[PDB]
Write a protein that binds this ligand. Structure first.
Ligand code: FAD
Ligand code: FMN
Ligand code: RBF
Ligand code: FES
Ligand code: FES
Ligand code: CA
Lengths: 204, 198, 408, 387, 446, 251
């Protein structure tokens, strides 16, 4: 049913409630045109990997399951890498290693080891798409709040004229560094946990 | 030697990938509560990243370097495959040996191995090694330096979060948000060595 | 074109070499030997299993199952066992219900113990005697709007050894039962109609086990007496599933039998002979009556106590034929009650309202030494919280306050 | 308003249990005593800023164009009428007035906006308005370039309060220096306004390099100031007539202030001893090594001790007890570490000219690790059963 | 072990001249029920009953036995309960001379008794309420035994009596007490004495250790660290010298000895002196007419570690050998926090107090400044002489944790010593009571 | 035993996935090789002034106009071979075609220099109007790579563009500013004595200067880096022997 796919957006957000998938989040968001591609890759890879692993969940062994699962996910990431280098190579150069780092981006690891190993392939696919969308919400919001202040542009298209052209704005230098992502994600977590109060951590 | 100490100090302080490349954060912000808890994880990362870099470098310079096996042919499109495979195999074998041959060391190292069996902080190190095309004698040193730097960063974060037991964090940010802000301020501190040459 | 097959064979070879090395390590290092678990210190019999299984689930396959109420899920928090060997590696998950002082003598939460080497148990003797019986219901009187006096006929009149306050284990199969055919008197049928409780039904496809505490006292054997509470879901949430096991027992018919098992001791009366205060609520009437009968009719210790109960109305009153007789029979025992909103025809005189206020104003506030007695409460939280707050105000501590709940 | 009596009067309460006598020292006294320790440096810095402004401006302009310039920015537009003149031989009445007109707006904005943040958070959590704000406000307003616009300072202090201290739970609960975080925010987000050669002198349209940066590009003979054209000597930089920030000059006029608090026991002298020994040791090591490249390799300790931003940082920023280590033997390690860093990242890091602001933020992270090491050693000793 | 170089003995006004003098009449004597840590009340008396001296008055239901006895004959007049029905004070009125008799021995026998016999006689008399176990400050169980019994033959509390004058008066009674204690150890008896000369016992089990210096150099807590480090598995016992005198009198004559010597002194005391009295005397009646006109707060015990004595608590504590009085400083001063007071006092040099050597202050009970978070400023380093780091142990204690406090060494302390570190704190915290809370938590979960 | 049940499945899945992985890898290699050129083609065409919108057009007019060529740095003479696939970056990483520089030689802070480089020539026919020179040096944070376009006289700069610099934007990496780039038109590389006389002037070069270019505002290390780069690669150990031949003709 439709009502259960939106859960990883707010109710079970993968970067807010749990600590999966932070490396790509805090490294890619320097722009927005790269954040969009990074979120599409994560969504598609997670969905296909969960679908496949759930499809063959009843025949793989538990002794060396790590090797089989990382093989079946690698056979997909090594394909999306070639696709990116064939169509969006101008974007792909910017991500550099992080496009390959989807191998160990803990989103796939956790979702595959938690849900697809015991659920039907179609719910596994829907779970993957939902988790990817939930992660992509945070990715896109952090990307917007970083790019808009750091360059006065969104999607590489000017919205705030820079001071070089007599504009109303001066590009903040700190946003283009890494510590911007940390504080932005921190305030995002504060807003999420204050508008959805049931996720507040305990005292002791 | 100038080179084999400069590279070590380089990897140790100037590009600490815990805090200059920002890898391995999924466990950086998860197993950081007690100093004598994170010390073991630091040691495990040191040993895994000191073992998995030389073997991977050998196999890359032997059989996946272009024209290294047969002239005119290359195997660039399975480097991720072989890196992650050798990493997982090494982790599994080391954990089994730790549980079998030397049981008392399992409490200090063996327990932590199942966590880091795959990780950004290790895969990125392997990828950077293969990208910069190091020789074996410097690759081993780079791996050791990366491991020790990661251990230093995680131990320092554990110390900070131990000292913060007197804090009064607002209820919304309690825990995860304050951990993220602390790590960001840690990056702000570690930006000191951004420009030094070594 | 030529390099495609070359890449294929190289990929397959490298993966196969990795897996071969992993299995070559696996088949030469992992012990995979026989592990022996001693059910007691130098026991008559032992258990042999393979490593990697849960201790409680492995032991339950051979017997001596524990009083855990979640069946290995770790929800009960009381699967306490004692092991003096095998491993002193207390787990952080066990610290949820284990303490630093108690952990020093090998006590453990079996639900969190994963077997890896040889270890010995030191379970107490009485646990070994757990077994099962099947008994026929001989009386299911409707003593109140939401309670039933369920009488059981024990096979061969076996005298099962137990202490008052203990609980037995009962099982139920899959079922589909509607409330329109339950035994409800016409007077209480109006109360059922007040919310149309007959309309409810429940579909269960699973076997279910719960715990029930016997009402009769240990000297009374051959017949075991249990009180069963209403199983309806809250009217404010109509779609919440009803009580499955309780519904099965309510629908259980006369003559028809059901399986009983696992008489487990808990809530034991203290060995001392000080004055006692007995406060009950709802379905705690069974353990209260059991404890009342125990020392009086069995031990004949010259103690002193009183039983205070609270009821919605005179309709919800029962066992008066026993209490009003025993109180005159011996001076060591007294009993009292209060009515919340008695009906006009109840013709009630005396204590009203909730039990806590009447207790304080009648007995505690002018007592000589409330700090040298014992308190037992077996009732719903809305009374439990009030009575415990009153008692902590009065000045008694945790070593004198004893209580439990009927599964919620 | 009448509500200020709360912070004027003492509350007038009595003890309830345990020690019924109490020491009279307290946080409100400590913060104000630090607030009164910088004045012999702040007034000299104001005078110095006015002097450098006058010297550079009158070296550049003259005549009708100078009249137009002094009829330009509101600094000169105000100080020309409020009791001073812009000529070359002006004294206190113009020099200090110009310095004050430069410094007061920055302070009056930083204080207002930071106080707004503090009162908002304190009212939300309903405690009394903490007194740890005055010290941070002064120590941030004293360490910015004079030409820095007001709103950049407002954003800097907002960051340094909300992100570094206030969120962690107020005074004494945080773990990193608030004012130095606030300065780091500007130092990294607007490099064209806090570092360079166009912001260190208040003169409009004038270029004057940082005093230290000249050695990085030339020998000891390249410490030339273009204010009127002379040579910057060791005694000159020690008295503090060099160009620079509003408060980080006059090492002597700052040592006089800092000796008071150090002798009074407000600031631990162990950290100062450790930082000094680390700095002298490492600088002597670099001087012994030597190299024809990186001209900074040859500056000795007696030259490092006064140039740039070392003295003020060492005397006030380092000694912050909340950020510093706690153990008696860990204070030495903290001092030696910061003393090594403030020379290392100034000698072998050509990208940045100024080092203490980075070194303090670096060593604040490792402040508790030394504490943990010492505590572990002490616990080992106790388990050995000798106390 | 012989010297200490930290901690500041407080320079207060109204020191007492160490001369024994007779005291006023005594009417009401009570036993406090709150200072006995962990004890819960189970009384054997009712309002209006009549009791004898040394008779059982009430016993605790936590420990097995350890009966508390009335200190003098008379009748029970009232029982002042507290909130939540806690036992605060059992006040009795003096009348008659009915007492309970106990066996007596000779001087020669006093060194070779049987340990069980000694323990039985002692616990039956009720002097067993004196001894306290160092890791928790509770009276030891009726059967326990540990190898270290510390006798505090010195006193460095502010404005306190000098034991050299009191012990010299009783003389051989102290020797008898030490000889009888020599067999109740299974170990050794350590007596901590100043540089002067004290009566000496001939039993090789006992020892003499010299201590001198600032204030913390006289408490049993500090005596522990340099002679017998207390641990979780090594408990040890401590008793003041007057209780040794009482034990010696008991085993030398056969009757409980109840007289006490209190050093009535203070800033507001008209004429300090060494008073003779019975334990638990009503403070309001003991301090009558000795106060100068003004609002005062009668504080039992030493100034650093006493408990207020208004109303129900107005009685001498069991463990206190001195009484003090202070003037209630409820005044409000304009800018006094910044005014360079000539008469103010402070451990730090932040005031004019430290310039004038030997000046004496009339300290009052004003808490300078409201509650604020402790920085700190390294004040505690100059104070605590024990080989531990307190500037972060105090932070741990204020954080509510117990597991790390036990590691750092919170076991070796109690409210007796930490009061000095509470005194110098700038944040105005209450580590003295915080330590009690933490130790109670560790005892409960242990 | 699990032995056979694991080997069978692992080999089966390896065969299943290897075919698709390798097919994808070899299928797109042509497209990767072709698309690797546009990011440089755009810059080269823009520095030559032949504006081209769209990758198809970019490759079309580059195939029409520009002829890659090789040159020997020593003696400043051409060499035989093809430059369309010559890896200039890798040529400095091997001893057989590079030499480690020494203290007086390392003015560009590179420490490596290829023995044979690549030079691009733009043509309107069988004659050359402009010749593009790829020059790189070391800045503050990292290396910078750029094209300097000179006319056939060997004296005048016609345009300068940095296609990748990796500096701090705003003050350091301002070399990409179109206004700053537009300054370089008409400037002169050499003087009468044939020495390289390009000077980066801080605070704004004098108006009409024939050897000055505005120093980057507040980036003195970067200005010094670019000055060192030009002073090295215009010396007799760089493109100077070739520039002599450019002025000698036959381009
Ligand atoms: C040691 C012990 C002794 C006991 N002794 C007695 C005794 O003497 N007498 C006695 O009557 N009981 C006793 N009990 C309780 C007994 O176990 C009951 O049967 C208990 O209610 C469980 O039965 P059930 O599973 O049918 O009902 P439950 O479902 O456990 O509870 C019934 C109620 O819960 C609601 N409910 C069911 N599922 C949900 C859900 N998912 N969410 C919310 N509400 C839900 C139902 O609608 C109904 O209102 C004892 C329990 C224990 C542990
Ligand atoms: C965060 C930061 C980054 C900087 N990065 C560069 C840089 O990449 N390149 C550069 O030339 N200057 C950079 N600068 C400026 C220089 O450090 C210095 O201010 C400049 O060389 C001014 O020198 P001058 O006074 O001699 O003109 C940076 C400054 C800051 C604060
Ligand atoms: C000796 C001393 C030095 C201080 N130094 C600083 C400082 O450098 N920066 C700052 O923001 N606050 C400083 N403070 C104020 C205060 O301690 C600081 O805000 C703490 O971090 C608050 O917990 C100082 C206080 C004292 C007593
Ligand atoms: S830590 Fe980076 S993806 Fe998990
Ligand atoms: S089995 Fe339920 S708590 Fe362990
Ligand atoms: Ca080139």
């Amino acid at each position: 049913l439709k009502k259960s796919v939106l859960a990883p957006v707010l109710d079970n957000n993968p970067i807010a409630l749990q600590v999966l998938g932070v490396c790509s989040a805090l490294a890619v968001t320097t722009k927005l045109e790269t954040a969009f591609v990074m979120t599409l890759a994560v969504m598609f890879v997670t969905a296909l990997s969960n679908f496949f692993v759930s499809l063959i969940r009843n025949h793989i062994p538990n002794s060396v399951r790590i090797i089989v699962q990382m093989a079946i996910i690698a056979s997909l990431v090594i394909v999306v890498d070639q696709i990116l280098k064939a169509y969006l190579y101008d974007i792909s150069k910017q991500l550099s290693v992080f496009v390959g780092l989807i191998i160990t981006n803990c989103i796939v690891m956790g979702r595959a080891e938690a849900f697809a190993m015991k659920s039907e392939p179609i719910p596994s696919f829907i779970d993957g798409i939902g988790n990817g969308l939930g992660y992509g919400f945070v990715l896109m919001t952090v990307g917007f709040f970083r790019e808009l202040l750091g360059s006065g542009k969104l999607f590489g298209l000017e919205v705030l004229p820079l001071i070089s052209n007599g504009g109303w704005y001066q590009p903040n230098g700190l946003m283009l560094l890494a510590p911007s992502a940390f504080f932005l994600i921190g305030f995002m977590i504060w807003a999420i946990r204050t508008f959805k109060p049931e996720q507040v951590e305990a005292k002791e | 030697m100038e080179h084999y100490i400069s590279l070590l100090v380089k990897s140790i302080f100037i590009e600490n990938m815990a805090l200059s490349f920002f890898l391995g954060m999924c466990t950086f912000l998860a197993v950081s509560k007690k100093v004598k808890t994170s010390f073991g994880l630091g040691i495990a990362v040191i040993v895994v990243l000191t073992i998995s870099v030389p073997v991977n470098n050998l196999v890359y310079n032997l059989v996946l370097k272009p024209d290294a096996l047969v002239e005119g042919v290359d195997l660039s499109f399975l480097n991720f495959i072989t890196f992650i495979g050798v990493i997982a195999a090494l982790v599994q074998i080391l954990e089994m040996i730790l549980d079998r041959f030397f049981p008392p060391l399992y409490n200090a190292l063996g327990i932590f191995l199942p966590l880091i069996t795959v990780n950004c902080a290790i895969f990125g190190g392997v990828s950077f090694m293969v990208q910069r095309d190091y020789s074996f004698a410097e690759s081993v040193v780079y791996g050791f330096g990366s491991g020790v730097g990661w251990m230093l960063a995680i131990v320092a974060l554990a110390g900070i979060r131990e000292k913060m037991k007197y804090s009064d964090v607002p209820p919304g940010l309690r825990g995860l948000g304050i951990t993220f802000i602390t790590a960001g301020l840690m990056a702000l501190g570690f930006m000191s060595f951004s420009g030094v040459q070594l | 074109m030529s390099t495609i097959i070359f890449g294929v064979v190289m990929f397959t070879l490298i993966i196969l070499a990795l897996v071969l090395v992993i299995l070559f390590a696996k088949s030469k290092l992992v012990p995979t030997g026989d592990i022996t678990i001693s059910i007691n210190g130098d026991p008559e019999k032992a258990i042999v299993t393979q490593p990697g299984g849960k201790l409680l689930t492995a032991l339950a396959g051979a017997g001596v199952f524990v009083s855990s109420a979640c069946g290995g899920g770790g929800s009960c928090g009381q699967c306490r066992v004692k092991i003096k060997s095998g491993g002193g590696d207390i787990l952080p998950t066990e610290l949820d219900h284990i303490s630093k002082g108690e952990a020093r003598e090998g006590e453990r939460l079996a639900c969190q113990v994963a077997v890896k080497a040889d270890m010995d148990l030191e379970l107490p003797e009485e646990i070994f005697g757990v077994k099962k019986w099947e008994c026929t219901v001989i009386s299911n009187d409707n003593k109140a709007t939401f309670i039933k006096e369920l009488k059981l006929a024990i096979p061969d009149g076996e005298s099962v050894p137990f202490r008052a306050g203990g609980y037995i284990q009962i099982e139920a199969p899959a079922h589909h039962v509607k409330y329109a055919d339950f035994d409800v008197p016409e007077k209480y049928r109006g109360d059922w109609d007040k919310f149309n409780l007959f309309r409810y039904e429940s579909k269960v496809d699973e076997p279910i086990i719960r715990a029930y505490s016997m009402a009769n006292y240990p000297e009374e054997f051959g017949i075991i007496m249990l009180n069963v509470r209403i199983a309806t879901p809250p009217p404010n949430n109509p779609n919440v599933p009803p009580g499955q096991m309780s519904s099965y027992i309510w629908s259980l018919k006369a003559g028809d039998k059901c399986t009983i098992s696992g008489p487990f001791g808990e809530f034991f009366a203290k060995d001392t002979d000080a004055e006692m205060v007995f406060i009950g609520g709802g379905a705690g009437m069974a353990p209260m009556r059991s404890h009342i009968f125990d020392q009086l009719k069995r031990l004949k210790s010259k103690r002193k106590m009183s039983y205070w109960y609270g009821a919605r109305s005179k309709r919800e009153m029962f066992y008066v034929e026993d209490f009003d007789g025993l109180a005159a029979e011996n001076d060591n025992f007294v009993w009292h009650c209060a009515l919340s909103d008695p009906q006009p025809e109840d013709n009630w005189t005396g204590y009203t309202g909730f039990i806590h206020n009447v207790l304080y104003e009648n007995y505690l506030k002018d007592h000589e030494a409330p700090e040298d007695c014992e308190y037992y409460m077996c009732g719903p939280p809305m009374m439990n919280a009030a009575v415990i707050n009153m008692l902590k105000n009065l000045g008694v501590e945790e070593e004198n306050i004893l209580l439990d709940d009927f599964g919620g | 308003y009448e509500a200020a009596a709360t912070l004027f009067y003492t509350p007038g309460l009595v003890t309830k249990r345990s020690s019924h006598v109490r020491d009279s020292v307290d946080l409100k006294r400590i913060m104000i005593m630090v607030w009164l320790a910088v004045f012999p440096a702040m007034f000299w810095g104001m005078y110095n800023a006015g002097g450098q402004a006058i010297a550079a401006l009158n070296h550049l302009y003259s005549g009708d164009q100078l009249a137009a310039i002094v009829a330009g920015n509101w600094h000169y537009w105000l100080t020309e009428m409020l009791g001073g003149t812009m000529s070359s031989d002006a004294g206190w009445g113009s020099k200090m007035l110009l310095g004050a007109t430069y410094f007061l707006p920055i302070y009056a904005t930083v204080f207002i906006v930071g106080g707004f943040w503090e009162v908002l958070f304190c009212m939300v959590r309903k405690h009394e308005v903490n007194e740890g704000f005055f010290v941070t406000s002064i120590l941030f307003a004293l360490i910015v370039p004079p030409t820095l616009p007001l709103w950049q300072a407002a954003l800097g202090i907002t960051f340094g309060v909300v992100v570094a201290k206030e969120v962690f739970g107020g005074t004494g609960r945080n773990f990193l220096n608030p004012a130095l975080a606030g300065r780091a925010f500007l130092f990294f987000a607007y490099p064209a306004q806090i570092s360079g050669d166009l912001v260190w002198t208040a003169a409009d349209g004038y270029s004057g390099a940082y005093a230290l940066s000249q050695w990085a590009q030339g020998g000891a003979g390249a410490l030339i100031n273009n204010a009127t054209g002379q040579t910057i000597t060791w005694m000159d930089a020690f008295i503090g007539n060099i160009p620079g920030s509003i408060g980080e000059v006059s090492t002597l006029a700052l040592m006089i202030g800092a000796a008071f608090i150090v002798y009074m026991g407000i600031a631990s002298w162990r950290i100062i001893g450790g930082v000094m020994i680390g700095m002298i040791l490492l600088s002597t090591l670099f001087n012994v090594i030597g190299s024809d490249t990186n001209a900074m390799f040859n500056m000795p300790w007696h030259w490092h001790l006064v140039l740039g931003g070392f003295a003020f940082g060492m005397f006030f920023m380092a000694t912050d007890p909340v950020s510093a280590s706690f153990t008696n033997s860990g204070k030495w390690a903290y001092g030696i570490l910061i003393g090594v860093m403030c020379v290392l990242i100034r000698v072998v890091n050509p990208a940045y000219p100024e080092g203490m602001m980075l070194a303090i933020l670096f060593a604040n992270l490792f402040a508790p690790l030394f504490d943990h090491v010492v505590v572990e050693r002490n616990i080992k000793r106790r388990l050995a059963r000798y106390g | 072990m012989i010297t200490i170089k930290k901690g500041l003995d407080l320079p207060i006004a109204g020191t007492p001249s160490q001369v024994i003098s007779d005291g006023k009449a005594i009417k009401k004597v009570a036993l406090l029920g709150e200072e006995y840590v962990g004890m819960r009340p189970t009384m054997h008396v009712r309002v209006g009953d009549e009791v004898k001296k040394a008779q059982i008055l009430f016993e605790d239901k936590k420990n097995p036995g350890v009966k508390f006895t009335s200190p003098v004959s008379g009748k029970v007049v009232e029982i002042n309960r507290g909130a939540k029905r806690v036992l605060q004070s059992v006040v009795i009125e003096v009348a008659g001379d009915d007492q309970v008799t106990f066996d007596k021995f000779e001087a020669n026998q006093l060194a070779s008794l049987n340990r069980d016999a000694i323990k039985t006689q002692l616990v039956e008399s009720g002097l067993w309420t004196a001894f306290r176990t160092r890791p928790f400050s509770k009276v030891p169980a009726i059967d326990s035994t540990s190898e270290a019994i510390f006798v505090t033959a010195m006193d460095t509390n502010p404005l306190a009596a000098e034991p050299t004058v009191v012990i010299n008066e009783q003389s051989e009674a102290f020797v008898a007490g030490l000889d009888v204690l020599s067999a109740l150890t299974t170990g050794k008896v350590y007596v901590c004495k100043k540089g002067t000369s004290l009566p000496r016992s001939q039993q090789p089990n006992v020892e003499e250790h010299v201590f001198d210096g600032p204030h913390p150099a006289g408490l049993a807590g500090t005596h522990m660290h340099f002679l017998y480090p207390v641990s979780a598995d090594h408990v040890a016992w401590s008793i003041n010298y007057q209780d040794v005198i009482a034990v010696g009198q008991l085993f030398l004559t056969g009757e409980l000895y109840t007289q006490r010597v209190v050093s009535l002194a203070g800033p507001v005391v008209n004429k300090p002196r060494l008073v003779r009295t019975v334990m638990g005397a009503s403070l309001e009646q003991l301090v009558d007419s000795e106060i100068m006109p003004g609002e005062v707060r009668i504080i039992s015990g030493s100034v650093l570690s006493g408990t207020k004595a208004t109303g129900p608590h107005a009685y001498l504590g069991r463990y206190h050998l001195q009484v003090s009085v202070l003037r209630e400083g409820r005044d409000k001063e304009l800018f006094g926090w910044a005014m360079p007071g000539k008469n103010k006092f402070s451990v730090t040099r932040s005031f004019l107090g430290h310039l004038f050597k030997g000046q004496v202050y009339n300290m009052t009970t004003t808490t300078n400044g409201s509650d604020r978070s402790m920085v700190p400023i390294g004040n505690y380093e100059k104070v605590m002489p024990l080989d531990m780091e307190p500037t972060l142990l105090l932070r741990d204690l204020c954080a509510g944790d117990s597991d790390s406090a036990v590691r750092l060494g919170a076991l070796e302390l109690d409210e007796e010593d930490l009061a000095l570190c509470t005194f110098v704190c700038p944040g105005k915290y209450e580590y003295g009571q915080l330590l009690r809370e933490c130790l109670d938590k560790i005892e409960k979960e242990g | 035993d699990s032995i056979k049940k694991t080997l069978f499945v692992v080999i089966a899945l390896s065969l299943v996935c290897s075919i698709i992985v390798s097919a994808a890898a070899v299928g797109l290699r042509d497209k990767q090789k072709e698309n690797a050129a546009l990011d440089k083609q755009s810059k080269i065409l823009q520095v030559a002034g032949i504006e081209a919108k769209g990758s198809k057009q970019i490759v079309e007019l580059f195939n029409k106009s520009i002829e890659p060529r090789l040159v020997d740095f020593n003696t400043g003479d051409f060499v035989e071979g093809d430059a369309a696939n010559y890896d200039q970056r890798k040529a400095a990483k091997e001893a057989s075609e590079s030499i480690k520089l020494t203290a007086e030689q390392d003015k560009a802070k590179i420490q490596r220099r290829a023995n044979v480089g690549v030079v691009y020539l733009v043509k309107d026919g069988d004659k050359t109007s402009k010749v593009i020179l790829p020059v790189h040096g070391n800045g503050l944070w990292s290396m910078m790579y750029a094209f300097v376009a000179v006319e056939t006289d060997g004296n005048t700069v016609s345009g300068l563009t940095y296609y990748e610099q990796g500096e701090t934007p705003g003050l350091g990496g301002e070399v990409e500013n179109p206004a700053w780039r537009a300054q370089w038109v008409g400037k002169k590389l050499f003087d009468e004595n044939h020495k390289p006389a390009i000077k980066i002037v801080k605070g704004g070069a004098p108006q009409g200067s024939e050897h000055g270019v505005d120093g980057l505002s507040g980036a003195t290390l970067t200005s010094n880096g670019v000055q060192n780069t030009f002073d090295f690669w215009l010396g007799d150990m760089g493109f100077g022997p070739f520039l002599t031949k450019v002025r000698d003709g036959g381009l």
